[PDB]
Amino acid sequence: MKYQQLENLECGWKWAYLIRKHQEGEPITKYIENSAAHAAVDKLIKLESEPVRVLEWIEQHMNPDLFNRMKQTIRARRKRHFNAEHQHTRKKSIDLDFPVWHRLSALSQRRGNTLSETIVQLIEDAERKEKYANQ
Amino acid sequence: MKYQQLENLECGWKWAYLIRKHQEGEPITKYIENSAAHAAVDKLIKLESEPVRVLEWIEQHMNPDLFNRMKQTIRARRKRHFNAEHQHTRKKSIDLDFPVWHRLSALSQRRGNTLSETIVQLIEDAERKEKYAN
Amino acid sequence: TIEERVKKIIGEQLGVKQEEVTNNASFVEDLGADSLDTVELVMALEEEFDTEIPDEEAEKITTVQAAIDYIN
Amino acid sequence: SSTHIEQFMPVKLAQALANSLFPELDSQLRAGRHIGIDDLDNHAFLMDFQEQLEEFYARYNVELIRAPEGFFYLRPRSTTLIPRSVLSELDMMVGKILCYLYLSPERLANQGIFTSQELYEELISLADEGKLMKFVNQRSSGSDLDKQKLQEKVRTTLNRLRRLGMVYFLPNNNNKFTITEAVFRFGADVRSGDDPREIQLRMIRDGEAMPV
Amino acid sequence: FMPVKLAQALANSLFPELDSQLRAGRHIGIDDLDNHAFLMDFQEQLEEFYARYNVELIRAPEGFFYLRPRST
Amino acid sequence: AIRVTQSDRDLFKHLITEATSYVSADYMRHANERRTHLDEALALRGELFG
Amino acid sequence: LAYMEGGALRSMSDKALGALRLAVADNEHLRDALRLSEDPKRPERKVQFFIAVYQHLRERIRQDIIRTDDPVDAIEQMEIELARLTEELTAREQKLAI
Ligand SMILES: *P(=O)(O)OCC(C)(C)[C@@H](O)C(=O)NCCC(=O)NCCS
């Protein structure tokens, strides 16, 4: 375990995830009947200010499909929240044109390293040329 | 004007965007009184499946400060919709660690190029160095 | 400008009023910045103008006027 | 969505207007009745939904106003949708006197229960007997018939004020009454320590008091 | 709560003037086009609203509306 | 009156104590890591200069 | 708290937030401020929310004598009033019995 797990934070994250999914129209409930699903969703809504009971609501009415996506999303959210403290641990999102990204991904898969590592090697070769030009 | 604008598509886009903003809590309407705002939002909600009247709805009750944001959101939506047809025109999104991004942006700002152009030039130089050595 | 970027840095690194920070306002006695506070002030001044300063020449700076004099 | 109260009216205002107490309170208010702490139910009702009622009544161009003493009432504007009227000068005399009795400790033994005779005695004590009588009848010079006429006029004005809520007759007695804090309005011209002639203009500008 | 259509009728901007004129005893005939149409549309709810006052909202055979006070 | 005043006192007490608990903890944390990071940075600076 | 490490501070802050969630559900804007205070990129938000809490309890003061606007100060006056009311309640119940 590298990141401390906080119950009252992950529970709120989970509740927000469930509510967002529902309002997007997806069937978070495991119930096919309309009435039971509506009742379960209403109870979840009542559970807004009690994140602790949200784990139990999950164990009672959460759709079996969503365990993997749930455990993925909250894990990623935890990582991002803990990395956001310092700039040097943050991530920056950029968009690349298809030809450029194709060449870069082919090069990275060739060298067997992540995109950031490939960019590091590339910019380091360019900076080595600059350095030897400077000396 | 590079991309032709289609009413039955952009109007659906606008309706979805406004419904999303309202669901997010953004004040869609210019009416501070809650009753008028709710009435206008209900009109919009029941206004689904209508371009020629959602446009008028926007003209009449839309919040003044959201016009620019909606316009640029629709611009981006149009561009992405037209570019998503072909592979070469699509755009690939990646995440870069902050130091690497900082250095890359430093280079790009220094040379006046974009991120794509800067990386293309650098890769071409790397290939040229390989050929020099080889 | 530099002569007001210096005030921006000093005020937002020591929390003192813009009015308080005059040219002759010494950090320790006027602005109250102590050892670590002055260290952070000099570090911020370095960061603002993306330059570096020697240890002795930096520690010699103990006033707004001296700060600008070394900056400009 | 449609068929939804928030479309037309705020929820709390609708709840207030649907409460069993709303009609009697509204009729009394429009009639000109002041509300004091004694009417516990009505006072609490006004306090809970006070803001909804000011904004509702604003639609009539009349301000639901709560004086610092804590009594609510209605002040029509020049553009009032509900007609407006001003108390008589004799009404002012009796109201000022009533405020005095509320604040007067000499009558503390009465414990708030007062008879019209005592009110008249105090009125004549503090006012100008004959020159006040002049208004009752232009040709009065101390005649006891005109004296009884002034007593009857004071009684009638007291009854009207009872209608306005400034005074309550006792559950069984119409010849004795208990004062209410609403009477404090009769002192609004002196509650502020400034020149009388500027405060009068301020009040008349606010619509609190017209001249005669 | 409150009836929805009753809330709609009360909220209508015509309601204050019409309510004042009714409580003043005025009779609303066919000549007052806006008021008469409003009363026609929302009678089913204004009758209940004014019955809460122990008064009856009566539409005469001629058509005009008015308020009849009960003993209470 | 007793019920209302007791409820008000309990609410005030709980709110104040919980808010202080929530805030001061993170405040002291940030202070401690700030001190630690400054201590770390001085050595790097010293080595870099030479 | 200066002695402890980051983990315990984080845990107790989480527990305090859990208490707050119950303590704030009634309010709307205070609850929204509490929610916004959760972003780690803007710690100052936390303090702002704290201010709001004070900026709330200031307006909950009942009458003039309890206008020691510092909320921590009103506690003693309110406890004095509770004790007083206890004596009056004893007297009043005796009166009712008789
Ligand atoms: P303040 O009284 O806490 O003093 C802080 C400090 C001036 C001692 C500190 O900021 C500092 O300068 N430490 C390093 C001193 C030095 O010159 N060391 C050589 C390089 S590690």
Author numbering:
A (entry chain J1): 1 to 135
B (entry chain I1): 1 to 134
C (entry chain H1): 2 to 73
D (entry chain E1): 2 to 213
E (entry chain F1): 9 to 80
F (entry chain B1): 248 to 297
G (entry chain B1): 1138 to 1235
Provide excerpts from the study.
We then reconstituted a complex of MukBEQEF dimers, MatP, and an 80-bp DNA oligonucleotide containing matS close to one end in the presence of ATP and magnesium ions. In addition to dimers in the apo state, dimers associated with MatP and DNA were readily resolved. Because we positioned the matS site close to one end of the 80-bp DNA used for sample preparation, two dimers were able to associate with four DNAs in a “tetrad” arrangement. Different classes of tetrads allowed us to assess the distance between the two dimers. This is explained by sequence-independent binding of the clamp, which can associate with any position along the DNA double strand. The architecture of the MukBEF dimer permits binding of two double-locked loops, whereby the loop axes are parallel and monomers are arranged side by side.
The ring-like structural maintenance of chromosomes (SMC) complex MukBEF folds the genome of Escherichia coli and related bacteria into large loops, presumably by active DNA loop extrusion. MukBEF activity within the replication terminus macrodomain is suppressed by the sequence-specific unloader MatP. Its SMC subunit is MukB, which associates with the kleisin MukF (Woo et al., 2009; Zawadzka et al., 2018).
